[PDB]
Paper text:
Small-conductance calcium-activated potassium (KCa2.x, or SK1, 2, and 3) channels are activated by increased intracellular Ca2+ to induce potassium efflux and regulate membrane potential. To enable high-resolution cryo-EM studies of human SK2, we designed a chimera (SK2–4) that contains the transmembrane and extracellular domains of human SK2 and intracellular domains of human SK4. SK2–4/CaM forms a non-domain swapped tetramer with four CaM molecules bound, similar to the previously reported SK4/CaM structure (Lee and MacKinnon, 2018). The CaM C-lobe is constitutively bound to the HA and HB helices, and upon an increase in intracellular Ca2+, the CaM N-lobe binds to a unique S4–S5 linker, inducing a conformational change in the S6 helices to open the potassium pore and activate the channel.
In the structure, there is clear density for the S1–S6 regions, but as observed in the closed conformation of SK4, the CaM density is weak and the N-lobes of CaM are dissociated from the S45A helices. Furthermore, the S45B and S6 helices collapsed around the pore axis, and the pore is closed with a radius of 1 Å at the intracellular gate at Val390. The structures of SK2–4/CaM in the Ca2+-bound and Ca2+-free conformations confirm that the chimeric channel is gated by Ca2+ and that the mechanism of channel gating is similar to that of SK4. In the structures of SK2–4/CaM in both the Ca2+-bound and Ca2+-free conformations, Tyr361, located in the center of the selectivity filter, is rotated approximately 180° when compared with the homologous Tyr253 in SK4 (Lee and MacKinnon, 2018). Focused 3D classification of the S3–S4 linker was unsuccessful in identifying particle subsets with a dilated extracellular constriction, suggesting that either none or a very small percentage of Ca2+-bound SK2–4 is in a conductive state. This, along with the similar conformation of the S3–S4 linker in the Ca2+-bound and Ca2+-free states of SK2–4, suggests that Ca2+-dependent intracellular gate dynamics are not coupled to the conformation of the S3–S4 linker.
Author numbering:
A (entry chain G), B (entry chain F), C (entry chain H), D (entry chain E): 82 to 112, 119 to 130, 135 to 147
E (entry chain D), F (entry chain C), G (entry chain A), H (entry chain B): 120 to 281, 295 to 475
Write the structure that this text describes.
Amino acid sequence: SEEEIREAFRVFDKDGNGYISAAELRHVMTNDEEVDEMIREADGQVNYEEFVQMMT
Amino acid sequence: SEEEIREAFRVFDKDGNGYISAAELRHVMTNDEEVDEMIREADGQVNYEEFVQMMT
Amino acid sequence: SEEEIREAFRVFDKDGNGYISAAELRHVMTNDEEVDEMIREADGQVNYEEFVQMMT
Amino acid sequence: SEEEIREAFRVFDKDGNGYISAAELRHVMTNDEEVDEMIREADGQVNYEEFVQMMT
Amino acid sequence: ALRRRRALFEKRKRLSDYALIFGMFGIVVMVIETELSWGAYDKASLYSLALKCLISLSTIILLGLIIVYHAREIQLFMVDNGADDWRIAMTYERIFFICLEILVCAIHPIPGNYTFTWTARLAFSYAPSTTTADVDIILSIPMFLRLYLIARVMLLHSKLFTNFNTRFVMKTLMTICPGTVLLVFSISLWIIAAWTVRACERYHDQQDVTSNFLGAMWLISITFLSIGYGDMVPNTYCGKGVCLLTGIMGAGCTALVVAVVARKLELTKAEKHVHNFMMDIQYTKEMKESAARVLQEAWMFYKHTRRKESHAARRHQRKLLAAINAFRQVRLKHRKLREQVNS
Amino acid sequence: ALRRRRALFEKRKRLSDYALIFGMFGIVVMVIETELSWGAYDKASLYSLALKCLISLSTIILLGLIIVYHAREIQLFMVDNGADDWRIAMTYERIFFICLEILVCAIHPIPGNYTFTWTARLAFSYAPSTTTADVDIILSIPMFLRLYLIARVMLLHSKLFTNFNTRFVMKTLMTICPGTVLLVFSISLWIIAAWTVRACERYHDQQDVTSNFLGAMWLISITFLSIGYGDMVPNTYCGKGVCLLTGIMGAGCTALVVAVVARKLELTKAEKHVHNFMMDIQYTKEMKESAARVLQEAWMFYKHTRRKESHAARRHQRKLLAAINAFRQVRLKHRKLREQVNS
Amino acid sequence: ALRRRRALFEKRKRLSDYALIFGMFGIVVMVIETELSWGAYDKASLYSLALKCLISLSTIILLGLIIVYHAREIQLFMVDNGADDWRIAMTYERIFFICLEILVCAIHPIPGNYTFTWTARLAFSYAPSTTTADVDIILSIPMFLRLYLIARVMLLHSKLFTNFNTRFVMKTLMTICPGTVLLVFSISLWIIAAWTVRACERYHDQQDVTSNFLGAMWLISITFLSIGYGDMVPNTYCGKGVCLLTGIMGAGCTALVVAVVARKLELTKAEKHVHNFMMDIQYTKEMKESAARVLQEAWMFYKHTRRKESHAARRHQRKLLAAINAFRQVRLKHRKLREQVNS
Amino acid sequence: ALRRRRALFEKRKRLSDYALIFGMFGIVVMVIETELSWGAYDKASLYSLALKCLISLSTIILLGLIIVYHAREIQLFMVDNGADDWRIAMTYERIFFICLEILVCAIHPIPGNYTFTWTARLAFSYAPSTTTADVDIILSIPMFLRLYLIARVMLLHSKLFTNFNTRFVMKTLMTICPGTVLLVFSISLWIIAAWTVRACERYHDQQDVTSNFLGAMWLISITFLSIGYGDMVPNTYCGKGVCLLTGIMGAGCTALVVAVVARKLELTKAEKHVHNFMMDIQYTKEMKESAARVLQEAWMFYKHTRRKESHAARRHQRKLLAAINAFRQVRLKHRKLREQVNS
Ligand SMILES: [Ca+2]
Ligand SMILES: [Ca+2]
Ligand SMILES: [Ca+2]
Ligand SMILES: [Ca+2]
Ligand SMILES: [K+]
Ligand SMILES: [K+]
């Protein structure tokens, strides 16, 4: 599951910098309070370690 | 339309010199007064600028 | 027949040293007294010359 | 016809020396007096010029 | 400009949607009216006039939609080629196609009772039969030609679609999904043709042979597979024509299958590598046991040779030669496998 | 020299044109005479003698044209090989072919009333029937063999044509236009065979089963598609032979279709690049949404885990695993696409 | 861990073995009971109650085995994905499939005498016939759907097997052994369908036309090959449905053959090299004799030229030109062979 | 040594020649005896005893030839493998094959009058018919299995032949000459099966439907092409079995044709270069005239623009755009051709 989560995180990270931005988090949901809550509970930015902490 | 006209003019210009000759104009019609009239109205030779002037 | 016997002996000789071991003789039979008897009658190890002597 | 005759003569000339031998003439007939007569009428050996002289 | 051209695409997309809604509505009311006109009531009943007026009302609306749709196509041609005058777009080919759609879409059962004398000779008996059949049955069958609006909607609503002609669209549909195309069309033709055979042959069939809908589905199905007719031979030439039409589609749909089940049996590059690996494991084990039998039989030959017996060593020699042959066969099979893997 | 050889090509081209005009004229007068000889008048009428004299007049002219045409072919052989004597060109093979064309083209209804007793047992009833049929019907059917002049005209008038044998000409015609060849021949055989079945079976059919031309077209069509016979079983052996002949052509024309609809479904180099591009766009979007669902379900699992609920997180975990599986499937489909594009 | 997962594979392998034993046992007792219920005794006999109780006893045991087998599949899903709760594995798709197997495997002749009125119109006569048929015949036919356990056993016991879906397993079985798959299935369908046609049509056939088992095998065989029906047209819709089902399988099994006999006619790399060698030897000899005839005829032309004869040299010149042509033909055939060999 | 092995090849080649002579002699006398036993005389006549004694005399000679032939095969096995004892070569497989040939070749009409009661129900009538048929008819049909000696002679006398199994020999025969193999076998099966159907069905056919040889050839031919049966449905199970056997061979011979007419339509490397050249010439001329029309229509548009007319320039503009489109189409067709030529 970890490899799949890493692949999904890399897919989200279009800029290739390794840090997903809140604008990208908002964008990937269009395909309000919940996104801000998950940003707060996962954190001024989100990295891979926070991603796997939230996934687990 | 300009690209197609240019392609047709290049097809006519078999010698590749960029100037179509009156002999070639007479030849491409076999596939008397009208050709002479169009030569007069398009002009001692015809170039691409005259070709696009007559086309437009 | 000699070429086929040589090919079979090479197939048995997995280590590629050219000398088939008694452990390999025991192993190639699982696919007690008879194997020891044939080892004694073919011989502290068995080579290609002994193999073709036993085959003939 | 000349090209075909030359090709046939080259096919006959197996040794590649350009001179067909009487032994080859005798051999190419198995696939007595007539062969000797044609050898006499075509000639101590037969070349391409004699071949095309006999063909014509 | 580009925004205007996209707007014409939207209007052209919307009009084909409504033309399909009225296209299937006209057919559906025709099917209900045809089914009920047989036993529920008669052709002169007020219900028949009312239902045949819904078809006429839907046909008038549909014909206006086709004219408007082609009018939008004219505007798209004007924008694309930068022309203004109508006549610059009214080519001879387009006029024929516009008229063809109008003629196909304007055929429907006209309100009012009109009859004609229908005469056909029975099948397997050659006995003539004459009945006064209504004229609405020879106008209801052409109404199934309105199904071309389904293709138009499909092209105009396909995500992949939006040269892009019908040839490329059909060809790429036989690669992405060759089974769905050959199954939706086969089933749709099954119901449409079976009902058409029953509808045309409910007048000249009094033994309930082909007039039965379940018996008409069997006739269409055997004809489609080119098995035969059996005793389901149609009496009328409408039922014979539909059976022939299904037969032709049954020889082109059994020619696409041969050309689709041939591409679907070949192994891909990934599958070939997996297949080569599993075969190699099997042949590696086979070479081990085949040679092991060779040694076992070769020594067993020697053991009975010193036993001073005749029948003993003879059997072992025969088995040894058979083991040698099988050993050689597996070696050739293995060596061929390595050749394919390397290349 | 070269000018002379070109002149022989022109005369050879002109003679085959007139031989086709008289070839179809003889057939057309035969068809009109056969149709009218049944009901319009009788075989002994002066009209029958006159019309059967036009066929004889056209056959004598045609045979002279075939002899002259082959005489020109002799001259072309003399020029090409630089020979003078006639016998150098009169090989055994050419004599047989010249005689074959004369024999085929000299078969026509001879003027004068001649009859023979025709006996055949009816189909599906096995009841014998005897009628005194005219002899011109067994001579009219072979007249359709004059259609080989159409192939000769086609070859001698093809722009691409002018080894160049009939094998290469037919093979290249199945590539430039495989549909026109398989449609003109199919329709032409349809009318020719249907009329032949009706003409041979108008004597021994009194129930208007196969004698009807529209019923004979159905019999030929079902036999061609190998569907079956139904109740259209011919009574005579001329109608049985033609049905068999159509059946054989119906198994070779449904074998060319399988070998033509298989080449017409493969994607060209240009089409493959376009197809790869549109699939790549679709899979790029699919990978975005599949992973987006993965994150959404993965966090939704966490949100309900802290909610102290049991049934809540269980549903989200099940959806998360399904999203993971779909995410993996689209990745494999995408990766396979890149492999094909690179190669 | 891995040892536990292997243990689940063993239990899953063992359960499918017993489910096949009871699967075929239920069918076998059904076949014996159906055959004996016609003439040996009646539906109300104590033997009928006893034999129909063995089927019920085998069905109850089988349904428990299917539930336990899927329970093991649940445990394998739990181990593979590291989950504990049942609901994490009870997806909607799995529930439908589990219910489908239970419904298919629970259809069997219930003990007790129950009858229904069966009415069907005879074939080729259109005469209605009514008989009071037992209800166990419409429940015995679905029992043949239990053959899906054979596929499950095959996959779970295949050495090569142990994505590995049924698509890859079937595709690789059409490459390793394309003849055995197309022969075991064809023969198995032959016996199963022929008995089903006879069983459904032993009530409404009193002339021993299709009720005869040997006559039912002929009907299934001609329908499978799409030859036709002849006089073997079924009377009931169960016999018509099975004939249609065999027809569909007879158009997919004659489409796999065309796609298997096409791969089996192509020459391999090793076979092509051998084929090229033997052709080269033949053409080398042919070029020798063709040229030898060229010289022989060329000189024979000269010999008779000096003989002052006319007809003599003419024949030799004609033979010389024919020998020249044949010499050129073999040269082109040889040169083409070298081109293929080099590439 | 090698000379001895070649000697065994010669004796083995000679014995198969005589075994074929007596193989066809036994069949020919059987055919003559069967034909004459119907009307020429009766089964108890001295002619019947004499002719049935020639078959017995030929069978005894043939069986000795088969034993001697296999004895030579034993000696070739002894020389090849360097063995002496007989038992080293008498494997279980060889014993079964030797016994199979003896059993097949020993079936012939035994001299002496023996009869059995033959009962079969008529086709299309279901009326039973009983006749006392001779027992020699069920022994004459298996005599056609002696045709396997033709294959043995072909292999042992083929120049190219002399692994070299029957698989490679048949496969290479489908490449060198795929038409002769599919025509000799088709015609040979036609006569053999048609006579077998007539011979088995001359007892239970009193209406001369299938007993007629010309009517039996039609039945075999329609069944082979899978067209149907029509009214030629056999009454006996020998005529039904042969029709089924021809149907199976008629679905494998129409599957080889699809796989042979597909390889025969592809263009070779030499033909592709010629085809590309002629297409390039055509497209070069087409590009010249398409562009010439473009200029002509473009200037004609300008000429009427200055003429102050409305309808004049509109027509020329419409023609100019059509000429532009056709100019673009031929450019794409030409450019695709250059792409193929380069690669
Ligand atoms: Ca970011
Ligand atoms: Ca110029
Ligand atoms: Ca060792
Ligand atoms: Ca020499
Ligand atoms: K059929
Ligand atoms: K068929």
